[PDB]
Paper text:
Escherichia coli phage SU10 belongs to the genus Kuravirus from the class Caudoviricetes of phages with short non-contractile tails. Here we show that the virion of SU10 has a prolate head, containing genome and ejection proteins, and a tail, which is formed of portal, adaptor, nozzle, and tail needle proteins and decorated with long and short fibers. In contrast to other short-tailed phages, the tails of Kuraviruses elongate upon cell attachment. After binding to the host, SU10 tail, nozzle proteins, and short fibers re-arrange to form a nozzle that extends the tail.
The portal protein of SU10 can be divided into the wing, stem, clip, crown, and barrel domains. The wing domain is the largest, and is formed by eight helices and a β-sandwich containing two β-sheets of five and three antiparallel β-strands. The positively charged side-chains of Lys3 and Lys5 from the wing domain interact with the DNA that wraps around the portal complex. The two lysines are repeated twelve times in the portal complex, and thus form a high-avidity interface that is likely to bind DNA soon after the genome packaging is initiated. Anchoring the DNA end to the portal would influence the packaging of the genome into the head and its final structure. The tunnel loop from the wing domain narrows the portal channel of SU10 to 33 Å. However, the tunnel loops in the SU10 virion and genome release intermediate have the same structure, therefore it is likely that a different mechanism ensures the genome retention of SU10. The stem domain connects the wing and clip domains and spans across the capsid shell. The clip domain of the portal complex reaches out from the capsid and enables the attachment of the adaptor proteins.
Numbering used by the authors:
A (entry chain A), B (entry chain A): 549 to 648
Amino acid sequence: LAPLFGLEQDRYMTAQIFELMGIKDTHKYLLPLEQYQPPEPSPMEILQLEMTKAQVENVQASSQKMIADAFDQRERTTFEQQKAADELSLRQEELQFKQE
Amino acid sequence: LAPLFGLEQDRYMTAQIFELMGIKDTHKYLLPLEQYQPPEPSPMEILQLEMTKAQVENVQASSQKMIADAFDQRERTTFEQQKAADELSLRQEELQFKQE
């Protein structure tokens, strides 16, 4: 039942209890809900959220690096195969030329 | 109800209790809210916040380094391909020249 029992209901119950005994409630720290404003977030939680975001971004970057290096290895293998074929062709051509 | 029950309300409640028994309250450590000022932050929390900021910045720098090295690998592969093509062209030209 916590979701239904919000701040306003708790304040109303406390005010009823006070009216039963403490007729006056606004005289002290107790603040009417009308003038209440949400607390300002603290820097600690903000920086913790930023650190979590940075960590998840780092995980994503690591995955991106994995895929990128896989692609780089594929490209390097293809280039090596092409260069080997070209070198073989050049060697055959030179051999034939010198034999002629 | 903690957000509504601020410092002023707590001080007012304590003052009411004292007036019920301890008519005089300002005679000792108790300080009127008018003259109260927020406590000065301690160096420990400041340096902890600085360390957290440094750590998140280091995470961001690690991500930047990952992307930068990925780009560097791409550029190196492109340069290697271009140099291989140029070397093949030069070898073919030299072979044709010497055969002629």
